Scaffold this active site. Sequence first.
Site, PDB file in Angstrom:
ATOM      1  N   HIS B  89       0.992  -1.090  -0.163  1.00  0.00           N
ATOM      2  CA  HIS B  89      -0.032   0.172   0.096  1.00  0.00           C
ATOM      3  C   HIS B  89       0.622   1.320  -0.035  1.00  0.00           C
ATOM      4  O   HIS B  89       0.514   2.229   0.101  1.00  0.00           O
ATOM      5  CB  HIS B  89      -1.033  -0.136   1.225  1.00  0.00           C
ATOM      6  CG  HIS B  89      -0.437   0.560   2.607  1.00  0.00           C
ATOM      7  ND1 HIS B  89       0.134  -0.285   3.087  1.00  0.00           N
ATOM      8  CD2 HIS B  89      -0.306   1.619   2.925  1.00  0.00           C
ATOM      9  CE1 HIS B  89       0.763   0.271   4.376  1.00  0.00           C
ATOM     10  NE2 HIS B  89       0.404   1.638   4.105  1.00  0.00           N
ATOM     11  N   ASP B 132       0.143  -7.362   2.341  1.00  0.00           N
ATOM     12  CA  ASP B 132       0.697  -5.879   2.178  1.00  0.00           C
ATOM     13  C   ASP B 132       2.157  -5.859   2.236  1.00  0.00           C
ATOM     14  O   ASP B 132       2.908  -5.636   3.271  1.00  0.00           O
ATOM     15  CB  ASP B 132       0.303  -4.953   3.545  1.00  0.00           C
ATOM     16  CG  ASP B 132       0.561  -3.665   3.309  1.00  0.00           C
ATOM     17  OD1 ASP B 132       0.782  -3.181   2.251  1.00  0.00           O
ATOM     18  OD2 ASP B 132       0.639  -2.792   4.288  1.00  0.00           O
ATOM     19  N   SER B 205       4.495   3.213   8.166  1.00  0.00           N
ATOM     20  CA  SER B 205       4.221   2.099   7.175  1.00  0.00           C
ATOM     21  C   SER B 205       5.191   1.979   6.332  1.00  0.00           C
ATOM     22  O   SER B 205       5.630   2.944   5.417  1.00  0.00           O
ATOM     23  CB  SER B 205       2.962   2.398   6.610  1.00  0.00           C
TER      24      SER B 205
END
Lengths: 1262, 248
Positions: B89, B132, B205
Amino acid sequence: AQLREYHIAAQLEDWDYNPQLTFKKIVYREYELDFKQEKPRDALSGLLGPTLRGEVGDSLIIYFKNFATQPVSIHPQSAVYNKWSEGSSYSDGTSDVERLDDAVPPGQSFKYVWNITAEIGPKKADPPCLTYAYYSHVNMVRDFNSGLIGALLICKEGSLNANGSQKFFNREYVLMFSVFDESKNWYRKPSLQYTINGFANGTLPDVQACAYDHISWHLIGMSSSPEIFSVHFNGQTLEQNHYKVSTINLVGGASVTADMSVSRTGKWLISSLVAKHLQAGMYGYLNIKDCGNPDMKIKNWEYFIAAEEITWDYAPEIPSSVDRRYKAQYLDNFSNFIGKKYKKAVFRQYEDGNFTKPTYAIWPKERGILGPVIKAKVRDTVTIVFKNLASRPYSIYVHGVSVSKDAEGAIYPSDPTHGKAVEPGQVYTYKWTVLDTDEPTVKDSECITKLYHSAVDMTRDIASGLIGPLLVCKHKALSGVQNKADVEQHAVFAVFDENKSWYLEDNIKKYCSNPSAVKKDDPKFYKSNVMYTLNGYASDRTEVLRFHQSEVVQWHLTSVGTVDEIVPVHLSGHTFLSKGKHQDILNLFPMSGESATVTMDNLGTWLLSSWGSCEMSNGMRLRFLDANYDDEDEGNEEEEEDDGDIFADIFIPSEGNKRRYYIAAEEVLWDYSPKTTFKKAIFRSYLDDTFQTPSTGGEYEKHLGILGPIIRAEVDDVIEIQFKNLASRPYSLHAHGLLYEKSSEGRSYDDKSPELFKKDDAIMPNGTYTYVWQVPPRSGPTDNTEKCKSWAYYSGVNPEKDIHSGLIGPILICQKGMIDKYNRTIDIREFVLFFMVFDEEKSWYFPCSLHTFPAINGIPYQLQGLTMYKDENVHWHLLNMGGPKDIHVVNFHGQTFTEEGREDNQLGVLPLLPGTFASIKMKPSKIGTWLLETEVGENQERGMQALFTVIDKDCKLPMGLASGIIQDSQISASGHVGYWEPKLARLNNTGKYNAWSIIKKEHEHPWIQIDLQRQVVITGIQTQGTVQLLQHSYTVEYFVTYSEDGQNWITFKGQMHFEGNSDGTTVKENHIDPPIIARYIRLHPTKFYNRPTFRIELLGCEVEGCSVPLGMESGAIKNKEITASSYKKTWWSSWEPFLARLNLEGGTNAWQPEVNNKDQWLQIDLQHLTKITSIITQGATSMTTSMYVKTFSIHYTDDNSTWKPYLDVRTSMEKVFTGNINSDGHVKHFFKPPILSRFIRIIPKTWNQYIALRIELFGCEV
Amino acid sequence: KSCRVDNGNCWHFCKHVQNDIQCSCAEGYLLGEDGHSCVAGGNFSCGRNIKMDCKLGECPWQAALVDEKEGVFCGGTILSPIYVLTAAHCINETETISGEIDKLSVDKIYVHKKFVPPQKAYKFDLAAYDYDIAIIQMKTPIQFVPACLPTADFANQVLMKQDFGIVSGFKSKTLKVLKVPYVDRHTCMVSSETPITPNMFCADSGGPHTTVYRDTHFITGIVSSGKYGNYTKLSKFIPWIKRIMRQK
Ligand SMILES: *[C@@H]1O[C@H](CO)[C@@H](O[C@@H]2O[C@H](CO)[C@@H](O[C@@H]3O[C@H](CO[C@H]4O[C@H](CO[C@H]5O[C@H](CO)[C@@H](O)[C@H](O)[C@@H]5O)[C@@H](O)[C@H](O[C@H]5O[C@H](CO)[C@@H](O)[C@H](O)[C@@H]5O)[C@@H]4O)[C@@H](O)[C@H](O[C@H]4O[C@H](CO)[C@@H](O)[C@H](O)[C@@H]4O[C@H]4O[C@H](CO)[C@@H](O)[C@H](O)[C@@H]4O)[C@@H]3O)[C@H](O)[C@H]2NC(C)=O)[C@H](O)[C@H]1NC(C)=O
Ligand SMILES: *[C@H]1O[C@H](CO)[C@@H](O[C@@H]2O[C@H](CO)[C@@H](O)[C@H](O)[C@H]2NC(C)=O)[C@H](O)[C@H]1NC(C)=O
Ligand SMILES: *[C@@H]1O[C@H](CO[C@H]2O[C@@H](C)[C@@H](O)[C@@H](O)[C@@H]2O)[C@@H](O)[C@H](O)[C@H]1NC(C)=O
Ligand SMILES: *[C@@H]1O[C@H](CO)[C@@H](O)[C@H](O)[C@H]1NC(C)=O
Ligand SMILES: [Ca+2]
Ligand SMILES: [Ca+2]
Ligand SMILES: [Cu+2]
């Protein structure tokens, strides 16, 4: 607070289990005040005596009058009593004043005074009022069966009204599910009755409760021999202690407290959904009636299910594994038996009302004969459309849902039909909603387990194959898939009994060899049809239920069918996560499901099974794989070979500590009565890997009994058990809870591991192995609250028949850090109890039931080492392992305990289920000897029942070597060099010769025996030598050797040797954690400086620890109460009988009678009854001669105002003690069994000069 | 079953022979002359750090995804001189993408073919951020330190079986660091309304989530989204990474 006073009494009565032949019974009953007019007593209480209550801080009196043919008694499961209210008779060494309650003969009465403490009150997590039972302890098995039985309610503070009724609940009902065997009732009758509160054949008066009420249920199951129930209230759900339910699990001798919440009008049925119970007619009704009172995510579901008469084969792909004598008894169709498959009438789901296209291609894979899996959240509205296709009518019935009588789906014996029993070809639609009261609690798992079947003939309906799992879940399981978990599993342990089907003859007249002679009910034949299942599969199969690694699979177990026993279940390496706790096993009360969450923390194939009948073993089992995915194929493949797809989208644009033991399965001879003497295989620890040098016994291990050594560790630690056989037949080490590999399992089953991992499966004699077990977080304590987790370890070869043979042991995993200098836990007391009814008919050593010894730790009755202080944290690890028949409602008398991890849950009685082991915390409140137990009649009286002991916290008070109160005639030694005497071995004693000291030789070791002349409690010694000046000559080290029977004694080891003095004066004190109790004690010195110089003093207290000055010397006892037979008053000076006080000098010190004779006496009135244990006697000095009593007797007051001489237990007539030998000398005399009177007299038999003396009574306030 | 037993007393990767126990090592390491020791083979050996804000040189591997407009959008972890690991992502959510703690052209980028973005997690009622995971390939070889890549087993039974892990998660002007304890799978699954797949695990992230061992560093997971923090269980995507590495 308050003073509650009930007038109760026993008395016979012509009871009839049907009121619409009667039996004469002895039952309780509340007679009004002065026993004038009895009292109303509800018509619902039946046989059950009158229900008692009482908040916290209150006080209950019970005026018991025995109008029976036998001596009865009253007895509470709650520790709200003392030994004069205990109502139980055992060896407690108490006064005839404290045994007046033990039993009450015909016509006799008694005042039972109970003090409902705050220590025994419900408190934090418990409801307003807890439920308890009371009943004639005298012969419980014979006294109960008669009818003597009632219910006690230890309500909490401020939960009651004047009414005496609870304020929190709109209603309150006491239900006692009891099994009576008149064949045991004194007035013996050959009859067996299954009754609720005494009403058999479902005649229990109608209960009453408006609609939308809040009921507080207080169920009580009980019997003489092991009996389990599973009460149920139709279209109604309860909350058994913060857990939503619908099926209550009560055992014989246990109580249950739940709060219901009705919501649907109409009369509901009340039964124990067990096979036998239900056919015996045992049932009742909850006659709810409206009374005006007032009571998104939601996605009303909708299912299309139908009854189909199919051909079901329990035996598909029966693999080698299964037992041969099995597939010959139950499967194989030889011998005219029906075989493997019978005709069934199961459930099936469709996608549309046309009931044409089913929602599957094969009968679900894994869910056997199981119907469609229903589901629903809270506040959801499920809509089922049922369509009967089978021969005869059927129905749909769900559990844990407040269904309405319009959509109930159940048939009652009082009916001629409203969608209750649909017929062939007929279609009906049930429409019920999941009320908030049906919602599961914060304790419950995401999903609560439950079931559904036909209510036409529920039992016979299910045997014909009508069952299906039903899950009720919060607002989590979303879609409609599970949530939180990566696998929803089902393991329904159903026991289908064809002979109770509707096709019983459609099978015999089809699958039989010659139906002609087919003799249904012919044992061999019957048992055949009645076969066991797991999800419909009557045996293990070739396929294995495969799960991943590190994944959490949520299970949903539920024992259906006609199961009569508690269906236990087993895993391996993996453990269930029930009620926020880990358990390597799960017991299943019939018809009440449970929802665990066994994560896959271990890899490899494993076995799951229920262990009991040679039928339960195979009829209910299966294997499951637990591995990764591995390798890869791909990396290795590329390296040596042929690469494949990438699986990606391209893009780039942009400008623990060890621990080892040395066990060994030795062979021993065991008799349960030190013909009661059998041979058995046991365990036992050895010093090291050499063996032949078994580790010696300690004080604590003096109770373990048969149990093997205590395998103890901490989380993350690794165990290295170097087991080695030593017996006739091969044995093995299996460990529960711990994380063991396939090499440390100890069990042979379809495991796919190679011979490399099978070698642990079993070790033939002399065989030698090593079991590296691993303690992972999930094998120790769960959360700080908990201190130590309990686990067992036994044989693998053949668990049951091996565990009976004397092979079993305890495992303890405590908090990381809780183990001291030498392998023992600190700051707490530790006991391990094994409740099991050994059966030498099961043991291998004895010529797929006469010699039973219902004993604890293989020692019925005896045992020992159960000495704990009062108020000191003591834990009790309980381990049971019997089949489905040995439940053991464990009980501590006059005590109350909480179960570790759950310090907010009181209880006081704890049903110990098969393959169970939980730790509890004690901290007793009463001092003295008490019985611990099983409330189970049969066993209670046949061994299983060991006595324990408590000592006043303050039990290290100087015990009479400095003061001498211990005659110099009591101290003796093996020999002494010099003028040094044993008689002079006292503390702080001065003089040229102040101690005892001999001369050591190459001969034997010297000792010095101290006789207390009666059993006492010691918890410390003190040592020193005497200093001449230049040298001190003191003892450096030593050890003890007590003994209550004069000559034969044991050595103390908590430990072997103690610390000696540092000089010839310094006082070195030693402690004894496991208090010693014996008539005699000895000190054997090992090290010393110059010579074993010894002068000492003991530190302990009395067995009862009551001895306290009553006030004579202090003066507390006014001289008005001090009466006398005559006090000489000469013109000059007289001695009044109130001048008789100890250590009194001044004036006319003492009391002497004008007329000196064997008729004289000194009476000391205490007004109020007090307990007396020991009284000292003195003398007097004045002018002509100094006087003292050379000998004397003692008279006291009796229950009913009558004088009685202190008779001897070691003789015929009242003991005659030896008075003083001087004037200013003491001579404390004790009372074998304490005296509990209000009037003590002392009749002098011999005296010097003129009878004079100074008294100082000793006792407690009782 | 020794390997299972304390990791065959091995420093790194313990494997299996039929009655044996094979001991391996991480990339750029020399196995122990003992047959287990295992030591640093070179000066640019992975895992070696320096022995809040992660001192410059402490997180020699940590990476930073830079966008022309938004600057540092995501973090990464240097696996080799050519490829650096990141989150799925973290790609195609910003206009562009390109040894520093004070707040390089990207050639190719491999996004796992099963990654489920929020939007797509909506289109087919699927697990959000499932898979992910992604790998970025530099245009020019980076001059050295990278983190060591562990084996599924080693990571499952040795690494992820630790007390805490390192999550050098950076909005501060300087680099950050912190230790996060390994939470149970059930604890995790019952602690979030978001259903976590068997690919994830919980305890910026795009940053690295490493588990330490024998003064060495092994990449165990990578920042996801988010109560506990969610990470991509790199245990399940070890062969997928070797696939792309074994690129050539
Ligand atoms: C209305 O009235 C009432 C209720 O309102 C109902 O009456 C009662 O109905 C119930 C249910 O139908 C009956 O329960 C059953 O009772 C029988 C009878 O057993 C008694 O005697 C046994 C001894 O008998 C001798 O002979 C047999 C056979 O030769 C031998 O085996 C024995 O050794 C004896 O020599 C005795 O063993 C029984 O138990 C006693 O001892 C045990 C020790 O283990 C104790 O626990 C008990 O307390 C008791 O003291 C008993 O005394 C039982 O046999 C039944 O139990 C078995 O069968 C059940 C099916 O009904 C089922 O649950 C199990 O199979 C259970 O297991 C027993 O039998 C198995 C054999 O299959 C054995 O494998 C197992 O070891 C065990 O022995 C059952 O409990 C009441 O007896 C009955 N009372 C009456 C009629 O007075 C009535 O039905 C209602 N009617 C209507 C229309 O509503
Ligand atoms: C097991 O093998 C047998 C019994 O099963 C026994 O063998 C003994 O071995 C010891 C030592 O080698 C000898 O002293 C004995 O003479 C052997 N036989 C007997 C009958 O004593 C022994 O009990 C076990 N083996 C060992 C080594 O103890
Ligand atoms: C009974 O099923 C009828 C079948 O028409 C079909 O329904 C479609 C939606 C699809 O599922 C096809 O597979 C079916 O063959 C359906 O139309 C009705 O709704 C159902 N109820 C009736 C006929 O009362
Ligand atoms: C006697 O010795 C002991 C030392 O423990 C103790 O009773 C006391 O200190 C001494 N006597 C006294 C202090 O009067
Ligand atoms: Ca008593
Ligand atoms: Ca094995
Ligand atoms: Cu009792």
